Design an enzyme around this catalytic site. Structure first.
Site, short mmCIF file in Angstrom:
data_model
loop_
_atom_site.label_atom_id
_atom_site.label_comp_id
_atom_site.label_asym_id
_atom_site.label_seq_id
_atom_site.Cartn_x
_atom_site.Cartn_y
_atom_site.Cartn_z
N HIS A 1 -14.41 84.92 132.39
CA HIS A 1 -13.72 83.70 132.80
C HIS A 1 -12.39 84.10 133.41
O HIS A 1 -11.72 85.02 132.89
CB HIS A 1 -13.48 82.78 131.60
CG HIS A 1 -13.06 81.41 131.98
ND1 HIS A 1 -11.76 81.07 132.30
CD2 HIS A 1 -13.82 80.33 132.22
CE1 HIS A 1 -11.76 79.82 132.68
NE2 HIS A 1 -12.99 79.33 132.64
N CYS B 1 -17.96 84.81 129.82
CA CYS B 1 -16.69 84.04 129.68
C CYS B 1 -15.65 84.89 129.02
O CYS B 1 -15.19 85.86 129.62
CB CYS B 1 -16.95 82.65 129.08
SG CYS B 1 -15.66 81.59 128.74
#
Lengths: 188, 188
Positions: free
Chosen positions: B126, B106
């Site tokens: 992400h 992420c």
């Protein structure tokens, strides 16, 4: 618009993924979530040794109801502990009586059986919890990843936890809130 | 056969799903996982207010290396805290030097940038962390849900966490262990 409220009941042996994923996703949706320790306020050892600290004890959280949803994570030992609790019994009976949502995942639905909640409903569980849940024929079984029969919402395992959590969000806050919460997650 | 060992570095603001899912899945695989608190042994407040209790401080866990994998969860504030830590710098440089796996999800990969780890690698993050990661052109970007360039393993979000965790298990313990761990999860 008043925020909806969720009670997540956290017992020793709970499945930690099935605890955290719904808490996190519900909070993303603007639901006020109370992670309530069955045993009290002390940290809880989950099924794979993750230790989660409750927001409050169940004893105290029980006094700040009602809640729009009561959530029961899975884990064999967690579900057994939920099943043995008179406090949990009272909370679930009150929630059924008031036409509030009850959401349980994996072995979690077996606490519904223990507490005589939702008899007659169509339910799912983890495959390995099917026979415990079906003992006595009090429910109808489903293979669906998430199953909802009125205000009895059930699901199967760690890998259905996002689906389960989003189903709770949809039930409480509607389809658009659930869809908005879903997109940043990078689900497939 | 000696158990493989994983270090999961847990900082304030960590993404709790991205912490718990890899810990749990790795433990299912028989990996000995140490959840190490960056700040010390005290409970850690995650990005959506879940509180996780470390197994040990990073200060102590650093002394019980080496580890077969070092895992960096995401969360913007968690990743920022990881990025600011000299202890994390040292651990990651040692892991690169010894040809050990580094796994980050992420916003977690942005700590690799901060600590000058893996420059030249192909990475994912992400979507919302892409531009932080790509600042200066030190990496090549990928859209894959899990990306692995040698011993730099990256992934995108909460919804890629199972894939990320299983990729770590496969890398450490092989394909069959990962497949055995996967089936009871009820992934789609």
């Amino acid at each position: 618009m008043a925020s909806k409220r969720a009670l997540v009941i956290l017992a020793k042996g709970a499945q930690e993924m099935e605890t955290v994923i719904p808490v996190d996703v519900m909070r993303r949706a603007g639901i006020k979530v109370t992670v309530a320790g069955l045993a009290g306020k002390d940290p809880v050892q989950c099924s794979r040794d993750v230790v989660i600290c409750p927001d409050a004890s169940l004893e105290d959280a029980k006094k700040e109801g009602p809640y729009d949803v009561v959530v029961l994570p899975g884990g064999n030992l967690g579900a057994q502990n939920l099943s043995e609790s008179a406090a949990v019994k009272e909370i679930l009976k009150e929630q059924e009586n008031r036409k509030g949502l009850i959401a349980a995942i994996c072995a979690g639905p077996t606490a519904l059986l223990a507490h005589e909640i939702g008899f007659g409903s169509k339910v799912t569980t983890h495959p390995l919890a099917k026979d415990k849940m079906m003992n006595g024929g009090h429910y109808t079984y489903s293979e669906n990843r998430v199953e909802k029969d009125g205000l009895i919402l059930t699901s199967r395992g760690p890998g259905t936890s996002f689906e389960f959590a989003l189903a709770i969000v949809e039930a409480l806050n509607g389809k658009e809130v659930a869809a908005q919460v879903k997109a940043p997650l990078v689900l497939k």
